[PDB]
Amino acid sequence: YTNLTQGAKEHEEQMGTFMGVYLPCLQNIFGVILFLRLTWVVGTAGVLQAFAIVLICCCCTMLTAISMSAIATNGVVPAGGSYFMISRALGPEFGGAVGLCFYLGTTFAAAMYILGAIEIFLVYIVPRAAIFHSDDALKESAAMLNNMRVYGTAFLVLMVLVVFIGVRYVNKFASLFLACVIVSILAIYAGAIKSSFAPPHFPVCMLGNRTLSSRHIDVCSKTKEINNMTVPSKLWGFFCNSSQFFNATCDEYFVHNNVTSIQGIPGLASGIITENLWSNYLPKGEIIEKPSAKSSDVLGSLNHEYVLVDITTSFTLLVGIFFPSVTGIMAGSNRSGDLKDAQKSIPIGTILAILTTSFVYLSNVVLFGACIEGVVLRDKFGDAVKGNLVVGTLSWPSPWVIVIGSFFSTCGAGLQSLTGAPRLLQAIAKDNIIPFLRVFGHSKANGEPTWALLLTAAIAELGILIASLDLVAPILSMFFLMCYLFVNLACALQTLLRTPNWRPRFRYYHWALSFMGMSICLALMFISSWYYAIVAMVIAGMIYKYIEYQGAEKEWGDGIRGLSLSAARFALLRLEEGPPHTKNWRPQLLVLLKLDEDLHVKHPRLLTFASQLKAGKGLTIVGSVIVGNFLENYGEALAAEQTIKHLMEAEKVKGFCQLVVAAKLREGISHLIQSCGLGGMKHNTVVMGWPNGWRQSEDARAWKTFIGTVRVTTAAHLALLVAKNISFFPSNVEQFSEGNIDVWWIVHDGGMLMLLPFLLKQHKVWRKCSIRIFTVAQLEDNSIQMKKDLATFLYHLRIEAEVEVVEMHDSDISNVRRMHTAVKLNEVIVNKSHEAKLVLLNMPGPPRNPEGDENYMEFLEVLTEGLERVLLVRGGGSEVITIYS
Amino acid sequence: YTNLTQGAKEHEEQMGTFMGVYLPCLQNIFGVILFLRLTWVVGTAGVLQAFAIVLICCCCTMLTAISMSAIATNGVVPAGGSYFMISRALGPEFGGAVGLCFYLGTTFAAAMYILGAIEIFLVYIVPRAAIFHSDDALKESAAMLNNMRVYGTAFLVLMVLVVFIGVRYVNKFASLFLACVIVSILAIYAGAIKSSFAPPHFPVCMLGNRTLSSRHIDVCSKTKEINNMTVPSKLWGFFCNSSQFFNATCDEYFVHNNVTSIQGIPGLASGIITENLWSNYLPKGEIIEKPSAKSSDVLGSLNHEYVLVDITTSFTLLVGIFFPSVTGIMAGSNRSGDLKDAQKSIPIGTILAILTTSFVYLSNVVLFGACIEGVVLRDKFGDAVKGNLVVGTLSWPSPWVIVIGSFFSTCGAGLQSLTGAPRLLQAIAKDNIIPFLRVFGHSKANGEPTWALLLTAAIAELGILIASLDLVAPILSMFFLMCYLFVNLACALQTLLRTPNWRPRFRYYHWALSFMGMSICLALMFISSWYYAIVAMVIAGMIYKYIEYQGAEKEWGDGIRGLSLSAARFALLRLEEGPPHTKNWRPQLLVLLKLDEDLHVKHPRLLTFASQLKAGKGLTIVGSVIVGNFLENYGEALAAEQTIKHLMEAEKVKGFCQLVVAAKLREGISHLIQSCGLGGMKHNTVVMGWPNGWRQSEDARAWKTFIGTVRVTTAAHLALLVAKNISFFPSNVEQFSEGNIDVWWIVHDGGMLMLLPFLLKQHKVWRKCSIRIFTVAQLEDNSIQMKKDLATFLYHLRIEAEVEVVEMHDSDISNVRRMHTAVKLNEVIVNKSHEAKLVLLNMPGPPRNPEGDENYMEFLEVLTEGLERVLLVRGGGSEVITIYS
Ligand SMILES: *[C@@H]1O[C@H](CO)[C@@H](O[C@@H]2O[C@H](CO)[C@@H](O)[C@H](O)[C@H]2NC(C)=O)[C@H](O)[C@H]1NC(C)=O
Ligand SMILES: *[C@@H]1O[C@H](CO)[C@@H](O[C@@H]2O[C@H](CO)[C@@H](O)[C@H](O)[C@H]2NC(C)=O)[C@H](O)[C@H]1NC(C)=O
Ligand SMILES: *[C@@H]1O[C@H](CO)[C@@H](O[C@@H]2O[C@H](CO)[C@@H](O)[C@H](O)[C@H]2NC(C)=O)[C@H](O)[C@H]1NC(C)=O
Ligand SMILES: *[C@@H]1O[C@H](CO)[C@@H](O[C@@H]2O[C@H](CO)[C@@H](O)[C@H](O)[C@H]2NC(C)=O)[C@H](O)[C@H]1NC(C)=O
Ligand SMILES: CCCC[C@]1(C2CCCC2)Cc2cc(OCC(=O)O)c(Cl)c(Cl)c2C1=O
Ligand SMILES: CCCC[C@]1(C2CCCC2)Cc2cc(OCC(=O)O)c(Cl)c(Cl)c2C1=O
Ligand SMILES: *[C@@H]1O[C@H](CO)[C@@H](O)[C@H](O)[C@H]1NC(C)=O
Ligand SMILES: *[C@@H]1O[C@H](CO)[C@@H](O)[C@H](O)[C@H]1NC(C)=O
Ligand SMILES: *[C@@H]1O[C@H](CO)[C@@H](O)[C@H](O)[C@H]1NC(C)=O
Ligand SMILES: *[C@@H]1O[C@H](CO)[C@@H](O)[C@H](O)[C@H]1NC(C)=O
Ligand SMILES: [Cl-]
Ligand SMILES: [Cl-]
Ligand SMILES: [Cl-]
Ligand SMILES: [Cl-]
Ligand SMILES: [K+]
Ligand SMILES: [K+]
16 A cells, blocks of 8 residues: 655656545644644634634645645656656756755654654553653653653664664555554544533542642542541642641641532533633643632642643744644655556645545544533643543543554654655755765665665654654744745746746646745744744755756856856747747847958947947847858957957947858858847847948949848848948047937838937937937928827827928939939938938838849938938838837 | 035036045934933943944944945946945946835934934923823823924924925035034043043932932932921922821831932942943833842832833844934945045045944943943933933033034934935936836926925824834834845845946955845844844835836836846856856757758757757757748748747757858858857857768769868867768657667767767666777787776766777778778777667868868768767867766
């Protein structure tokens, strides 16, 4: 049946939902707190707050189980247990630091089960085998703690021995460890229902209003008839001198107040639940008393026969003591390779097991408060009911059914933790994620860890030397809550950031359920201590960074450099989806720099102007071509790249250089335009300079390369920016004191001609200029309506530019008519935009047949004649600008 | 002299270190806690713990000043105050959420200064102008708090009026606000030194061991001689009935215990400091008593004439009350545009001002405990010294010097906060980083915020309605500590991550000083409340994300997509430094895929084998060439990219596709080899397939393109991997059950031929194979020594491969001799490495002159004849492999 874990030895190498997931999860959730501490949790805090403590802890594990269901429906559910399932779904660095704190929680749970078994042994079975039976004095805790230290060490030593020499017999005894749990739960239900008509007889002796210990007491009368003569009782001797001394010198409060006997279990049909609703938080050392019991109001001495409060108690202390009961939800995955359909079995079996154990916990809170007297619930170790378990007194056939049933339930839960946690630590020693843990993978002939079992014994001996189960249980509650924190955090983080292999195929999963489970784990950690919560999450964060540094060191070769290569890769893969065209166009530049012979930059002011356009943000790529043969020019291309990078730092350009050696200049330019960047991170716009001296020099190749670049750019659906007289453009230390920036918008590309002066004006050079926008009007439309349609187009974006509509005349808006509509258009622009520091206007497209490339180059010379600084702007076709920054 | 801030109106538009930085910083650090609360902080906690409270708070601001010095030595120190200096050095998202919490700390400081002035008014000047002079009853705090609410509202309303109508007169009164501080400090020093030989006379009336209030008491005798007849005193009437009633019915403790009078200031030359060393933490309501004073031991009633403890006190409550005294260190930067050398003045003036104020605070802790009686220090409001300030009683000329001097010191500090914080909120309304704060930039004719001043009045009225200065002072201590947190955090984070424009030009700056200042700010926040510390750092974190989302929305066009483009840009710029060649070689692939006509992939098993080599990690780029003209083939290149991306997902390749249209196939291949990636994130290795059918088909272009790619690859200093018979390579669902991987290492590229089977073996397909390594031995060396030199070369890296040295014979290690040393070498390989599932061997280089390209292609055909799956490996020249993962 195998409620034990797999771990390694089966990751390198039949069951359904019920016997493969549901019953192994149920066995590991049920345990010692239900039988040894839960009546005391209803005794303190009342029924109403103990119902809230159980409900808060159960909602935390249920949300964590939904995140665990999303992990089991991601990949193919590997055959190694829960550690291999979490590590392959959340990657490394979340497999580690979940596996390490689940390991520490299992190692400290094994100490809590061994201490829980020594308590059922030393109380309730043989209160005679105590080594330190000390003097009858004020130290009743110092001799009890040294009794648990000696017996709990010897119990742990014999239990490491069973894990070593025979673990196959721990496997096949799983069916009777589960049967001891189930018949103990069914005995509590049977004996609570029977108390509606036949309650058991367990009397409690009360002296006035105070609860007396029922040990060392034969009769609760203080009178003690024997045979028609009244010798006073043994209870008389504890509050006076010797038992023949009816004469005098009695204790106060005792001379007053009569001695009565109440029922410890009134049953389900009485109204004792109305007395058990509210809380009884008391400091350590106060007498346990009950309301509706009569008491004078005197003040006597403090006897040794009273039942006192064990420790000081609060709401947050009771949360950390109940919480190890709801853990054990990773048990549904530790038989992963032996399931038929593990993708379907693990969510169904785990979630149903949470609903079963939470019903048993929530219905026991109501049944303890409705059947048991409150002064019996409010003392552990059962001094008021003469040394019985309080939950044992409620069960029908005998209290010995629960005492023997919970002794073997706790002996098997400790044996389960002491095989599981070495098998987990050995599986983290492999995958080589933490290299100094290498020695703890030292498997024997058939799995069987050797040095990992020795380390779990020494850490669990820390939690044996720390005795008192009420102190160990908050320590392992912190480790399990920190384990459930990182699972809930990593599940919601990978679906919000679209981690490449994360796609949970499980309905009723949402990221807001994992975030909600992450918030409850944090709240339960900080109400416990908060300064062990700050330290543990700092230590777990440095473990996250240590595994991430080691993973980057063997993925990229270097640790520190590999952390930037991994961050760049994840961000670039996130962009590879398919809506890349933002409805807010921003120019991402590809700057084309020509090189002359001796390999110097011809026009370095293109880099200055590109730095004023981007202002240190966005993407900028500088592209260049060396004409020649690459097999002979690789050393000349490496030194030419250091020249451009030295020049980019001088002109305050923060970007990338891409240089190529090509046999033709036109071929290397066209390949830079279509292949710069790495997918998503690519250019929007090509920037180049005007070919100055194209007409008068020589052979038609300098100005025909220019037309070929305009054609390649618009075929690629990219934007183009051509700067004319780039040697007259200002440097970075010039700063015009006044001036204009004139935009001549002509029926096309309006969104790009208005964004570009607004972007350029927030640089220091162009800061004090004013934007003027001009349109041309032809007779076959109205001029006034077109103006305020443009004023409203600017006023909602607070660009602050002034608008003029230029009324044109007999004109056209052949070839001699194109050189007549460019002469007329030039004299309108120069009449208004001479002395204007920058002019922006549309450039028209090249002709269809490359026959008219010299008529096109003469068109652009005549149109831009007489202007000092011109930027010709051409849109790519799809540039939607909605928000002007 | 101008101790006021600049803010905006001077960022869009003479002083040295002493008058420009040092004196404005000194004025804003000194204030109300020194004169109104510091004697009570030495009264409680003793001298020794109050010396530690002052030292802890002063070390926090000194480390923050060193981080502030690194900010002032980064850029050019802009002319707008401290907000513009922090925003340009730490970027946005740290300028905001520092400016917002510095704004809230200044707004709540203005309420603390107004409440501090009403206390010096209502006590100590006129205890007659109280509106709610209530009944002489148990409510002495409820009527005092409503007196501060009415006067503090009217004081705030008149003080917003002065900021509005005339602020130039607040500027020019700065020299006399500073003079009131300095002569009050010099009066405390003069009167403490004089008490060594001439102490002042301030008596304290004690009834036994208890401190009596000296108000309403004329004589401290209880006897009251007048003229030879003894009418009992007024002190007799407070502990009895009427003042003529020497008869009977006196109060207990009073009938006993005599009435004595002690000196409130014994002076510096006495030994009163030995009584003031230790702490006096008491709950609210207990009588202030002194040791070494005689008292019977009775138990009387609690009178109204005793001096009681004001509130319950602890160490952490006293840290939050002292801490607003050490703030004000941003004052040294608020005159940034008016300095000659602000880069040198701001570190020198700020750090020296911390040393001056911390000396005054640390030497006042010692002088208060050495000159003042402890029961006078332990009560605020001066009931034991008949209504004087306790620090006023120590000053020489009069107590009225400190009472008037600290009244104007606190009236000017409140006026300074109520002009500074509106000028800060108006400067955050500009830069447009938080768009819903747009209305608070509403400057008047000369700066002068209008709606920002109205918002500072309403938030400071929250801290007036919360009266009791001891409650407001922890609230603004949280905002200033959270301001100093993010400055210390952002300073250490940008120098550890190498933010592009962060280079602090200031010696005695280290990142570990900013991290140390970050740790002290966190500790002082969490010992205060911890649940207002968790909430405030969550709110400040969402403000960081809101500004980062808005900055990415206007830098890239889209908010969510722009966050990945910014993360990729910062990581890629971090790699652009200059040691790119890691001494641990890892293959980063550039996969060359040939396309046939109809634009299908010819050899799709290259993608399968590349996915088995990388196993989902690292960088992989798929490169391809369409032969043709790009102006007609841009639509055929867009559909061919969707075919390859659909195929990459089918073969489990996580990487990038780069496709280019070129006029020649050889030209587009050479440009893909030298220009794929974006700088740092680029390929190490070229992977291509063998040209199957090169001999028998047709014209020599299919196998001459292959030799040209081998030449371009080694000229680029890249590694090469050629796969032969790639159609016989296994798919991703094949998984060999047993087999070998044979490595034939021949005097070259040994580190690459041993890393590649080790990387391939951790994929599921090649998992169950065993690695065999073969070397060849020639006669002119020894064979046994070469074997264990190779065994040791593997055993330290636990590769687990077996080694054989193959003894060769008469051989060579022309052209007919190269085709004879390849026939002999082939028959050794096929004799051992047939039936071997993969063979790896070196390929030799192409010949110098492209004349022997067919002799080279025939050499590689003869050498690899008879083997099913071959990988030919050639190193680039610089591949150092030290750690084998
Ligand atoms: C308290 O009362 C008992 C009962 O009378 C006393 O016991 C008697 O003691 C006297 C002398 O000590 C004997 O002569 C009697 O025989 C005793 N009574 C019985 C019934 O045996 C006892 O001594 C008294 N104690 C005190 C301190 O007075
Ligand atoms: C319990 O103590 C009370 C007194 O403290 C005893 O009560 C008196 O008993 C008589 C008759 O039994 C009543 O009439 C009185 O009213 C009772 N007194 C009070 C104050 O109620 C009573 O005897 C003691 N109990 C026993 C069993 O003896
Ligand atoms: C307490 O003592 C004083 C002093 O003797 C009492 O005052 C006297 O009162 C009587 C009558 O009340 C007068 O005749 C005397 O003349 C008073 N003495 C003086 C000196 O005038 C006072 O009455 C006493 N009080 C009590 C309550 O006894
Ligand atoms: C203070 O109270 C004490 C007693 O509580 C008074 O002291 C007695 O005075 C005489 C002489 O003055 C001494 O011999 C005694 O030793 C004192 N008693 C004690 C207990 O010390 C004393 O008179 C009171 N003070 C004044 C000023 O009257
Ligand atoms: C604030 C982070 C402190 C820890 C640190 C590593 C992480 C493993 C041990 C220390 C330091 C560091 C340096 C980096 O690069 C610095 C450059 O470029 O020189 C990068 Cl990218 C990163 Cl993520 C990191 C880190 O997280
Ligand atoms: C863990 C909390 C995350 C909050 C979130 C923003 C932040 C303000 C609004 C939500 C969400 C988010 C989504 C991303 O991309 C997701 C894709 O690609 O679909 C990226 Cl890159 C980033 Cl940094 C982020 C964020 O920080
Ligand atoms: C008490 O003792 C016996 C009963 O065991 C009885 O015979 C005897 O008479 C009783 N004593 C008195 C005084 O009634
Ligand atoms: C009980 O009686 C004995 C008789 O010797 C006496 O010494 C003792 O003090 C008594 N007990 C009390 C508490 O007085
Ligand atoms: C007290 O009063 C005067 C002093 O003012 C003095 O003459 C008179 O004698 C004194 N009384 C006694 C009893 O000494
Ligand atoms: C004081 O004397 C008056 C005389 O009438 C008396 O009523 C009052 O109770 C006395 N004071 C005390 C506290 O007894
Ligand atoms: Cl349990
Ligand atoms: Cl668990
Ligand atoms: Cl101060
Ligand atoms: Cl400050
Ligand atoms: K459990
Ligand atoms: K201050």
